[PDB]
Short mmCIF file of C-alpha atoms and ligand atoms in Angstrom, two decimals:
data_model
loop_
_atom_site.label_atom_id
_atom_site.label_comp_id
_atom_site.label_asym_id
_atom_site.label_seq_id
_atom_site.Cartn_x
_atom_site.Cartn_y
_atom_site.Cartn_z
CA UNK C 11 23.90 -34.52 -29.54
CA UNK C 12 26.34 -32.02 -29.70
CA UNK C 13 30.02 -32.50 -30.08
CA UNK C 14 31.73 -32.58 -26.57
CA UNK C 15 28.47 -31.28 -24.80
CA UNK C 16 29.83 -27.89 -25.60
CA UNK C 17 27.79 -24.84 -27.20
CA UNK C 18 29.73 -21.78 -27.95
CA UNK C 19 27.84 -18.51 -27.25
CA UNK C 20 29.63 -16.35 -29.82
CA UNK C 21 28.44 -12.84 -28.47
CA UNK C 22 31.28 -10.86 -30.05
CA UNK C 23 29.91 -7.90 -32.19
CA UNK C 24 32.22 -7.63 -35.00
CA UNK C 25 32.61 -10.27 -37.88
CA UNK C 26 36.13 -10.25 -38.14
CA UNK C 27 36.66 -11.07 -34.17
CA UNK C 28 33.92 -13.35 -34.06
CA UNK C 29 34.84 -15.32 -37.03
CA UNK C 30 38.65 -15.38 -35.63
CA UNK C 31 37.64 -16.59 -32.27
CA UNK C 32 35.15 -19.24 -33.77
CA UNK C 33 38.30 -20.67 -35.94
CA UNK C 34 40.17 -20.88 -32.91
CA UNK C 35 38.05 -23.35 -31.45
CA UNK C 36 36.43 -25.09 -34.48
CA UNK C 37 38.19 -28.27 -33.63
CA UNK C 38 36.42 -28.47 -29.97
CA UNK C 39 32.65 -27.64 -31.32
CA UNK C 40 29.96 -28.46 -33.93
CA UNK C 41 27.33 -26.23 -32.31
CA UNK C 42 27.41 -22.60 -32.14
CA UNK C 43 25.03 -20.35 -30.38
CA UNK C 44 24.55 -16.67 -32.16
CA UNK C 45 22.42 -14.14 -30.86
CA UNK C 46 21.23 -10.35 -31.21
CA UNK C 47 24.60 -9.12 -30.14
CA UNK C 48 26.32 -10.36 -33.48
CA UNK C 49 23.29 -10.46 -35.80
CA UNK C 50 22.12 -6.65 -35.01
CA UNK C 51 25.83 -5.85 -35.45
CA UNK C 52 26.34 -7.38 -38.80
CA UNK C 53 23.34 -8.78 -40.33
CA UNK C 54 21.63 -12.00 -40.67
CA UNK C 55 23.77 -13.25 -43.62
CA UNK C 56 26.27 -13.79 -40.57
CA UNK C 57 24.41 -17.11 -39.92
CA UNK C 58 25.32 -18.50 -43.35
CA UNK C 59 28.65 -17.45 -43.40
CA UNK C 60 29.13 -19.47 -40.01
CA UNK C 61 27.36 -22.60 -41.47
CA UNK C 62 29.39 -22.35 -44.85
CA UNK C 63 32.81 -21.67 -42.94
CA UNK C 64 32.67 -24.26 -40.00
CA UNK C 65 30.26 -26.61 -41.22
CA UNK C 66 28.26 -25.97 -37.59
CA UNK C 67 24.69 -26.48 -36.57
CA UNK C 68 23.52 -22.65 -35.71
CA UNK C 69 21.34 -21.99 -32.85
CA UNK C 70 19.52 -18.38 -33.44
CA UNK C 71 19.15 -17.26 -29.57
CA UNK C 72 16.53 -14.86 -30.33
CA UNK C 73 14.53 -15.16 -27.14
CA UNK C 74 11.21 -14.86 -29.34
CA UNK C 75 8.75 -13.24 -27.18
CA UNK C 76 5.78 -11.65 -29.16
CA UNK C 77 2.57 -12.34 -30.09
CA UNK C 78 1.52 -15.46 -32.51
CA UNK C 79 1.48 -13.53 -35.64
CA UNK C 80 4.86 -11.80 -35.19
CA UNK C 81 6.44 -15.14 -33.77
CA UNK C 82 5.43 -16.71 -36.99
CA UNK C 83 7.44 -13.92 -39.07
CA UNK C 84 10.54 -13.88 -36.97
CA UNK C 85 10.99 -17.76 -37.30
CA UNK C 86 10.32 -17.79 -41.01
CA UNK C 87 12.94 -15.03 -41.22
CA UNK C 88 15.11 -16.68 -39.13
CA UNK C 89 14.78 -20.03 -40.67
CA UNK C 90 15.20 -18.63 -44.36
CA UNK C 91 18.79 -17.19 -43.00
CA UNK C 92 19.79 -20.88 -42.37
CA UNK C 93 19.45 -21.18 -38.68
CA UNK C 94 19.22 -24.89 -37.51
CA UNK C 95 17.13 -24.10 -34.36
CA UNK C 96 15.64 -21.07 -32.69
CA UNK C 97 15.20 -20.28 -29.06
CA UNK C 98 11.88 -19.22 -27.73
CA UNK C 99 10.79 -17.70 -24.49
CA UNK C 100 7.96 -19.57 -22.99
CA UNK C 101 6.69 -16.86 -20.70
CA UNK C 102 4.34 -15.04 -23.22
CA UNK C 103 2.20 -18.39 -23.26
CA UNK C 104 1.18 -21.53 -25.55
CA UNK C 105 -0.06 -19.86 -28.48
CA UNK C 106 3.11 -17.69 -29.24
CA UNK C 107 5.05 -21.09 -28.44
CA UNK C 108 2.83 -22.74 -30.85
CA UNK C 109 3.54 -20.25 -33.76
CA UNK C 110 7.10 -20.97 -33.73
CA UNK C 111 6.45 -24.99 -33.64
CA UNK C 112 4.34 -24.38 -36.74
CA UNK C 113 7.26 -22.57 -38.70
CA UNK C 114 9.77 -24.93 -37.29
CA UNK C 115 7.87 -28.20 -38.50
CA UNK C 116 6.87 -26.81 -41.81
CA UNK C 117 10.70 -25.86 -42.43
CA UNK C 118 12.32 -29.00 -40.80
CA UNK C 119 13.65 -26.88 -38.04
CA UNK C 120 13.83 -27.15 -34.28
CA UNK C 121 12.53 -24.75 -31.40
CA UNK C 122 14.24 -24.71 -27.92
CA UNK C 123 12.06 -23.54 -25.23
CA UNK C 124 13.60 -21.43 -22.64
CA UNK C 125 12.08 -22.28 -19.28
CA UNK C 126 14.09 -20.27 -16.36
CA UNK C 127 16.77 -17.99 -16.94
CA UNK C 128 20.45 -17.84 -15.39
CA UNK C 129 20.82 -14.26 -14.20
CA UNK C 130 19.81 -12.75 -10.80
CA UNK C 131 16.62 -10.94 -12.17
CA UNK C 132 15.10 -14.34 -13.27
CA UNK C 133 13.89 -14.69 -9.41
CA UNK C 134 11.32 -11.90 -9.94
CA UNK C 135 8.86 -13.38 -12.29
CA UNK C 136 10.38 -15.98 -14.53
CA UNK C 137 11.44 -18.51 -11.62
CA UNK C 138 7.75 -18.76 -10.55
CA UNK C 139 6.36 -19.52 -13.64
CA UNK C 140 9.30 -21.93 -14.86
CA UNK C 141 8.14 -25.50 -14.08
CA UNK C 142 4.63 -24.47 -15.51
CA UNK C 143 6.39 -23.18 -18.43
CA UNK C 144 8.26 -26.48 -18.83
CA UNK C 145 5.23 -28.62 -18.49
CA UNK C 146 3.56 -26.40 -21.42
CA UNK C 147 6.28 -27.15 -23.71
CA UNK C 148 6.06 -31.02 -22.76
CA UNK C 149 2.16 -30.73 -23.36
CA UNK C 150 2.98 -29.44 -26.74
CA UNK C 151 5.58 -32.07 -27.89
CA UNK C 152 8.50 -29.35 -27.07
CA UNK C 153 11.62 -31.62 -27.06
CA UNK C 154 14.42 -29.03 -26.88
CA UNK C 155 14.69 -26.83 -23.55
CA UNK C 156 16.91 -24.30 -22.07
CA UNK C 157 17.39 -23.86 -18.24
CA UNK C 158 19.76 -22.36 -16.18
CA UNK C 159 23.45 -23.61 -14.91
CA UNK C 160 23.70 -20.90 -11.99
CA UNK C 161 20.38 -22.81 -10.31
CA UNK C 162 21.37 -26.61 -10.23
CA UNK C 163 18.33 -27.50 -7.81
CA UNK C 164 16.27 -26.03 -10.53
CA UNK C 165 17.81 -27.41 -13.56
CA UNK C 166 17.25 -30.87 -11.72
CA UNK C 167 14.00 -29.95 -11.50
CA UNK C 168 13.45 -28.88 -15.08
CA UNK C 169 15.03 -32.12 -16.05
CA UNK C 170 12.58 -34.16 -13.51
CA UNK C 171 9.77 -32.55 -15.70
CA UNK C 172 10.95 -32.59 -19.21
CA UNK C 173 11.99 -36.25 -18.88
CA UNK C 174 15.56 -38.07 -19.60
CA UNK C 175 14.56 -38.08 -23.70
CA UNK C 176 14.49 -34.55 -23.86
CA UNK C 177 17.60 -32.45 -24.81
CA UNK C 178 18.59 -29.49 -22.36
CA UNK C 179 20.98 -26.95 -22.88
CA UNK C 180 22.22 -24.65 -20.04
CA UNK C 181 23.90 -21.34 -20.21
CA UNK C 182 25.63 -19.57 -16.89
CA UNK C 183 28.63 -21.77 -16.79
CA UNK C 184 31.79 -19.81 -16.42
CA UNK C 185 31.40 -16.27 -16.31
CA UNK C 186 28.17 -16.51 -14.29
CA UNK C 187 29.54 -19.11 -11.94
CA UNK C 188 27.97 -22.20 -13.16
CA UNK C 189 29.82 -25.40 -12.69
CA UNK C 190 30.51 -27.24 -15.67
CA UNK C 191 30.43 -30.64 -13.93
CA UNK C 192 27.31 -29.89 -11.76
CA UNK C 193 25.54 -28.82 -14.67
CA UNK C 194 26.02 -31.66 -16.95
CA UNK C 195 24.58 -34.03 -14.03
CA UNK C 196 21.34 -32.73 -15.72
CA UNK C 197 22.01 -30.69 -18.86
CA UNK C 198 23.10 -32.77 -22.28
CA UNK C 199 25.20 -29.54 -23.11
CA UNK C 200 26.39 -26.45 -21.56
CA UNK C 201 26.46 -22.98 -23.40
CA UNK C 202 29.69 -21.07 -22.76
CA UNK C 203 30.41 -17.73 -23.92
CA UNK C 204 33.00 -15.02 -22.42
CA UNK C 205 35.23 -17.52 -20.42
CA UNK C 206 36.07 -18.72 -24.09
CA UNK C 207 35.62 -15.87 -26.10
CA UNK C 208 37.32 -13.26 -24.04
CA UNK C 209 40.01 -15.83 -22.98
CA UNK C 210 43.58 -14.70 -23.74
CA UNK C 211 43.70 -18.31 -25.42
CA UNK C 212 40.47 -19.26 -26.54
CA UNK C 213 41.33 -22.75 -27.82
CA UNK C 214 43.17 -23.29 -24.47
CA UNK C 215 39.89 -22.06 -22.52
CA UNK C 216 37.76 -24.56 -24.74
CA UNK C 217 40.09 -27.46 -24.25
CA UNK C 218 40.10 -26.64 -20.39
CA UNK C 219 36.47 -26.68 -20.36
CA UNK C 220 36.15 -30.07 -22.01
CA UNK C 221 39.20 -31.50 -20.02
CA UNK C 222 37.47 -30.70 -16.70
CA UNK C 223 34.53 -32.65 -18.19
CA UNK C 224 36.21 -35.12 -19.77
CA UNK M 12 3.35 12.99 -27.53
CA UNK M 13 3.39 11.50 -31.12
CA UNK M 14 1.40 12.96 -33.94
CA UNK M 15 -2.45 12.04 -34.19
CA UNK M 16 -1.80 9.73 -31.25
CA UNK M 17 -0.98 6.84 -33.82
CA UNK M 18 1.98 5.10 -34.31
CA UNK M 19 2.39 2.80 -37.19
CA UNK M 20 3.54 -0.85 -36.73
CA UNK M 21 5.29 -1.38 -39.81
CA UNK M 22 5.77 -5.62 -39.95
CA UNK M 23 6.05 -5.91 -43.57
CA UNK M 24 8.93 -7.80 -44.58
CA UNK M 25 10.35 -6.13 -47.54
CA UNK M 26 11.80 -2.72 -48.12
CA UNK M 27 9.85 -1.71 -51.31
CA UNK M 28 6.65 -2.61 -49.47
CA UNK M 29 7.43 -1.13 -46.10
CA UNK M 30 8.73 1.88 -47.68
CA UNK M 31 5.84 2.40 -49.90
CA UNK M 32 2.91 1.96 -47.41
CA UNK M 33 4.73 4.03 -44.98
CA UNK M 34 5.16 6.79 -47.60
CA UNK M 35 1.40 6.38 -48.22
CA UNK M 36 0.40 7.27 -44.50
CA UNK M 37 3.39 9.61 -44.01
CA UNK M 38 1.00 12.55 -43.57
CA UNK M 39 -0.86 11.01 -40.68
CA UNK M 40 2.08 9.83 -38.37
CA UNK M 41 5.61 10.81 -37.15
CA UNK M 42 6.35 7.68 -35.16
CA UNK M 43 7.05 4.45 -36.82
CA UNK M 44 7.47 0.90 -34.62
CA UNK M 45 9.92 -1.18 -36.51
CA UNK M 46 10.30 -4.55 -35.27
CA UNK M 47 12.08 -7.88 -35.75
CA UNK M 48 10.14 -8.81 -39.09
CA UNK M 49 11.33 -6.12 -41.11
CA UNK M 50 14.72 -5.80 -39.27
CA UNK M 51 15.73 -9.62 -39.69
CA UNK M 52 14.63 -9.59 -43.53
CA UNK M 53 16.21 -5.88 -44.55
CA UNK M 54 18.84 -5.28 -41.90
CA UNK M 55 19.41 -2.85 -39.35
CA UNK M 56 20.24 -0.37 -41.83
CA UNK M 57 16.11 -0.04 -42.40
CA UNK M 58 15.93 2.13 -39.15
CA UNK M 59 18.36 5.01 -40.69
CA UNK M 60 16.46 4.42 -43.95
CA UNK M 61 13.27 5.38 -42.30
CA UNK M 62 14.42 8.20 -40.43
CA UNK M 63 16.11 9.88 -43.65
CA UNK M 64 13.15 9.29 -45.79
CA UNK M 65 10.22 10.15 -43.41
CA UNK M 66 11.64 12.32 -40.68
CA UNK M 67 10.04 10.36 -38.20
CA UNK M 68 10.75 8.91 -34.65
CA UNK M 69 11.85 5.24 -34.50
CA UNK M 70 10.69 2.78 -31.79
CA UNK M 71 12.51 -0.49 -32.15
CA UNK M 72 10.23 -3.11 -30.91
CA UNK M 73 12.75 -5.64 -30.06
CA UNK M 74 10.70 -7.07 -26.78
CA UNK M 75 14.41 -7.15 -25.07
CA UNK M 76 14.55 -10.19 -22.87
CA UNK M 77 17.94 -11.44 -21.98
CA UNK M 78 20.32 -11.25 -19.43
CA UNK M 79 21.89 -7.77 -18.39
CA UNK M 80 24.95 -8.12 -20.22
CA UNK M 81 23.60 -9.26 -23.44
CA UNK M 82 20.54 -6.57 -22.99
CA UNK M 83 23.33 -3.91 -22.94
CA UNK M 84 24.96 -5.49 -26.19
CA UNK M 85 21.41 -5.28 -27.81
CA UNK M 86 20.41 -1.88 -26.74
CA UNK M 87 24.05 -0.27 -27.83
CA UNK M 88 23.89 -2.10 -31.37
CA UNK M 89 20.19 -0.56 -31.71
CA UNK M 90 20.99 3.01 -30.87
CA UNK M 91 23.89 2.90 -32.91
CA UNK M 92 21.70 2.18 -35.87
CA UNK M 93 19.43 5.33 -34.88
CA UNK M 94 16.72 4.03 -32.77
CA UNK M 95 15.17 6.69 -31.04
CA UNK M 96 13.72 4.24 -28.42
CA UNK M 97 13.44 0.42 -27.80
CA UNK M 98 10.84 -1.56 -26.08
CA UNK M 99 12.10 -4.03 -23.24
CA UNK M 100 10.30 -6.74 -21.80
CA UNK M 101 9.93 -6.37 -17.87
CA UNK M 102 9.42 -10.10 -17.30
CA UNK M 103 12.95 -10.99 -17.18
CA UNK M 104 13.27 -8.65 -13.92
CA UNK M 105 14.95 -5.52 -12.69
CA UNK M 106 18.60 -6.15 -13.70
CA UNK M 107 17.61 -6.76 -17.31
CA UNK M 108 15.61 -3.51 -17.40
CA UNK M 109 18.41 -1.38 -15.87
CA UNK M 110 21.04 -2.80 -18.38
CA UNK M 111 18.86 -0.95 -21.03
CA UNK M 112 18.14 2.03 -19.03
CA UNK M 113 21.86 2.51 -18.72
CA UNK M 114 22.69 2.43 -22.24
CA UNK M 115 19.70 4.62 -23.12
CA UNK M 116 21.07 7.40 -20.59
CA UNK M 117 24.32 7.07 -22.03
CA UNK M 118 23.23 7.53 -25.82
CA UNK M 119 20.26 10.03 -25.03
CA UNK M 120 17.50 7.41 -26.11
CA UNK M 121 14.26 5.95 -24.06
CA UNK M 122 13.27 2.82 -22.99
CA UNK M 123 9.90 1.45 -23.08
CA UNK M 124 8.46 -1.29 -20.61
CA UNK M 125 6.33 -3.88 -21.82
CA UNK M 126 4.23 -4.82 -18.87
CA UNK M 127 0.86 -6.94 -20.08
CA UNK M 128 0.63 -8.37 -23.76
CA UNK M 129 -2.32 -8.16 -25.99
CA UNK M 130 -2.70 -11.62 -27.26
CA UNK M 131 -4.52 -14.42 -25.62
CA UNK M 132 -1.43 -16.28 -24.35
CA UNK M 133 -0.47 -13.28 -21.87
CA UNK M 134 -2.95 -14.68 -19.54
CA UNK M 135 -0.84 -17.63 -19.09
CA UNK M 136 1.97 -15.67 -16.99
CA UNK M 137 2.42 -12.30 -18.06
CA UNK M 138 -1.02 -10.99 -16.88
CA UNK M 139 -0.34 -12.13 -13.15
CA UNK M 140 2.95 -10.59 -13.17
CA UNK M 141 1.96 -7.34 -14.88
CA UNK M 142 0.82 -5.03 -12.20
CA UNK M 143 4.36 -5.82 -10.44
CA UNK M 144 6.15 -5.26 -13.62
CA UNK M 145 4.37 -2.09 -14.23
CA UNK M 146 5.59 -1.03 -10.40
CA UNK M 147 8.98 -2.35 -10.65
CA UNK M 148 9.31 0.34 -14.14
CA UNK M 149 7.82 3.03 -11.82
CA UNK M 150 10.21 2.33 -9.02
CA UNK M 151 13.10 2.70 -11.42
CA UNK M 152 11.98 5.98 -12.84
CA UNK M 153 10.73 4.41 -16.36
CA UNK M 154 8.67 7.08 -17.87
CA UNK M 155 7.57 5.06 -21.02
CA UNK M 156 5.34 1.77 -21.05
CA UNK M 157 3.41 -0.47 -23.49
CA UNK M 158 0.25 -2.09 -22.32
CA UNK M 159 -2.87 -3.88 -24.23
CA UNK M 160 -5.44 -2.50 -25.91
CA UNK M 161 -7.40 -6.06 -25.90
CA UNK M 162 -8.01 -5.48 -22.12
CA UNK M 163 -9.31 -2.22 -21.46
CA UNK M 164 -9.64 -2.99 -17.80
CA UNK M 165 -6.11 -3.97 -17.36
CA UNK M 166 -5.15 -0.85 -19.36
CA UNK M 167 -6.98 1.18 -16.83
CA UNK M 168 -5.16 -0.53 -13.94
CA UNK M 169 -1.68 -0.12 -15.72
CA UNK M 170 -2.38 3.59 -16.12
CA UNK M 171 -3.36 3.90 -12.37
CA UNK M 172 -0.04 2.21 -11.63
CA UNK M 173 2.25 4.61 -13.73
CA UNK M 174 0.46 7.72 -13.06
CA UNK M 175 -0.59 10.51 -15.30
CA UNK M 176 2.54 11.90 -16.24
CA UNK M 177 4.19 8.62 -17.73
CA UNK M 178 3.68 7.86 -21.44
CA UNK M 179 1.77 4.76 -22.51
CA UNK M 180 1.32 3.16 -25.91
CA UNK M 181 -0.82 0.33 -26.93
CA UNK M 182 -1.10 -2.30 -29.43
CA UNK M 183 -3.95 -4.47 -30.58
CA UNK M 184 -6.49 -1.94 -31.70
CA UNK M 185 -7.90 -3.25 -35.11
CA UNK M 186 -6.63 -6.66 -36.18
CA UNK M 187 -6.63 -7.82 -32.37
CA UNK M 188 -9.97 -6.26 -31.78
CA UNK M 189 -9.11 -3.41 -29.41
CA UNK M 190 -11.07 -0.29 -29.80
CA UNK M 191 -9.18 3.05 -30.53
CA UNK M 192 -11.53 5.24 -28.63
CA UNK M 193 -11.75 3.05 -25.76
CA UNK M 194 -8.07 2.63 -25.67
CA UNK M 195 -7.36 6.04 -25.81
CA UNK M 196 -9.01 6.83 -22.39
CA UNK M 197 -5.96 5.40 -20.98
CA UNK M 198 -3.38 5.57 -23.60
CA UNK M 199 -1.77 8.26 -25.02
CA UNK M 200 -1.12 6.59 -28.42
CA UNK M 201 -2.25 3.36 -29.86
CA UNK M 202 -0.07 1.36 -32.17
CA UNK M 203 -1.82 0.25 -35.43
CA UNK M 204 -0.12 -2.60 -37.71
CA UNK M 205 -2.29 -4.79 -40.01
CA UNK M 206 -5.35 -2.94 -40.16
CA UNK M 207 -3.31 -0.09 -41.94
CA UNK M 208 -0.61 -1.90 -43.89
CA UNK M 209 -2.68 -4.57 -44.99
CA UNK M 210 -5.37 -2.51 -46.14
CA UNK M 211 -6.65 -2.14 -49.65
CA UNK M 212 -6.00 1.59 -49.07
CA UNK M 213 -3.67 2.27 -46.23
CA UNK M 214 -3.91 6.29 -46.45
CA UNK M 215 -7.81 5.73 -46.27
CA UNK M 216 -7.40 3.17 -43.34
CA UNK M 217 -5.18 5.65 -41.42
CA UNK M 218 -7.28 8.60 -42.10
CA UNK M 219 -10.55 6.58 -40.86
CA UNK M 220 -8.55 5.57 -37.92
CA UNK M 221 -7.76 9.16 -36.93
CA UNK M 222 -11.25 10.53 -38.18
CA UNK M 223 -12.71 7.95 -35.77
CA UNK M 224 -10.74 9.40 -32.71
O1 BMP E 318 19.02 -18.06 -18.98
C1 BMP E 318 19.67 -17.58 -20.14
C2 BMP E 318 19.44 -17.82 -21.40
C3 BMP E 318 20.62 -17.40 -22.43
O2 BMP E 318 20.27 -17.76 -23.70
N1 BMP E 318 21.70 -17.05 -21.93
C4 BMP E 318 22.66 -16.39 -23.04
O3 BMP E 318 23.61 -17.45 -22.92
C5 BMP E 318 25.13 -16.88 -23.26
C6 BMP E 318 25.76 -16.85 -22.02
O4 BMP E 318 27.26 -16.37 -22.21
P1 BMP E 318 28.28 -16.27 -21.10
O5 BMP E 318 28.82 -17.55 -20.77
O6 BMP E 318 29.24 -15.23 -21.59
O7 BMP E 318 27.33 -15.70 -19.76
C7 BMP E 318 24.57 -15.48 -23.66
O8 BMP E 318 24.62 -15.21 -25.35
C8 BMP E 318 23.41 -14.92 -23.30
O9 BMP E 318 22.42 -13.92 -23.66
C9 BMP E 318 22.21 -16.66 -20.30
O10 BMP E 318 23.31 -16.32 -20.18
N2 BMP E 318 20.99 -17.08 -19.49
O1 BMP E 319 1.46 -6.91 -26.09
C1 BMP E 319 1.83 -6.73 -27.53
C2 BMP E 319 3.05 -6.14 -27.68
C3 BMP E 319 3.50 -5.35 -28.87
O2 BMP E 319 4.69 -4.82 -29.36
N1 BMP E 319 2.88 -5.98 -30.25
C4 BMP E 319 2.98 -5.78 -31.33
O3 BMP E 319 2.27 -4.45 -31.96
C5 BMP E 319 2.00 -4.73 -33.37
C6 BMP E 319 0.43 -5.15 -33.64
O4 BMP E 319 0.38 -5.18 -34.78
P1 BMP E 319 -1.40 -5.28 -35.31
O5 BMP E 319 -1.90 -3.79 -35.09
O6 BMP E 319 -1.18 -5.61 -36.75
O7 BMP E 319 -1.84 -6.47 -34.56
C7 BMP E 319 3.03 -6.00 -33.80
O8 BMP E 319 4.23 -5.49 -34.34
C8 BMP E 319 3.22 -6.78 -32.70
O9 BMP E 319 4.23 -7.56 -32.52
C9 BMP E 319 1.39 -6.76 -29.87
O10 BMP E 319 0.40 -6.88 -30.93
N2 BMP E 319 0.88 -6.93 -28.58
#
């Protein structure tokens, strides 16, 4: 369970701006998604910086998509840096997912399995594999999933596959055109990035998001 | 064209060991693949350190696999850090690939498109998409590709799709069981990691790999 069903996608690329904006909306969220735009710009230490400053859960959105051996290394370094969870692509297959699950279990952290993506290009290859990727996750005991706000019927199908007990978060609301309300019919929380962090008043944008799903 | 058709996959996770081992084999290679194991352990500054210390080409193996907007940011940060090239997954589709191509063109760097992967799990979803992924790359003017040493007939088919002029590099030789010689029937260079960097004598391992080819 995530505060206000709202996860901030902090994809600003310098620490001052990222910390300032996160500080502006800190009252509205307790979970922040940090990805490569911020990490590759400021270093992995930025994760510990967020956890200390905001007391928030951090999901490391690294879309892990390598062979098992390399996946293990990526997960180890990421959890060592303090991430509570890591997002892993399902498309590379079950061995690559299991590698991540092993490290997460060892270290007491979580894996989120990325099924279908929210952007148009997801239609080409990912969409056709997505139901089976979700099922693979279920079969392996994965409990956390990511699916697209921009395709409510796909999101609904993924929820059907993973069951009511699995945790499902969903990006694509706001900038990419997804609707928070519709999305939360199926997802437990929505991921929101630009529509908050590029807003003239990010606190107002966050409050507005929450208001509309009150 | 890379020196000795051999690209070092430097996946050690601390600066001292990575720099030491790369130094031991610097005579045999002019191209190093640096990925997230090293970068997430030591920081993006490690790329510039490699380029200055070894004068090598650096391929940032980041398997970029996000939406276009995020892909653009990842490529910008990566090329800003000095990477000569970046490896991008094709599975997320054409828009995600074009986002990377845009930044690469802007900054005078290269994109390598990952088609099929070398590990067993690649059978599940990637293999069935790989020919079309390769074709997508061709249609977009991609000139650099990655394909698997572990599946020579797949690698051969990928070469057929991309044509003789495209540059194809291939991981999976050594630790994963691929054969350097067979692989180089189709790929322009092999990527080698553990069989060199975990070797008791990495210089001998590199020399040996080269001698066999
Ligand atoms: O299917 C996917 C999976 C993601 O993690 N994401 C990501 O979630 C975020 C979306 O942010 P935004 O609200 O600005 O569109 C980004 O960090 C992005 O990389 C995506 O948009 N679609
Ligand atoms: O299909 C793929 C694509 C890769 O980049 N790689 C990668 O290339 C390297 C292989 O190293 P090794 O020789 O130790 O198996 C690793 O860095 C790894 O992540 C892979 O092994 N198969």
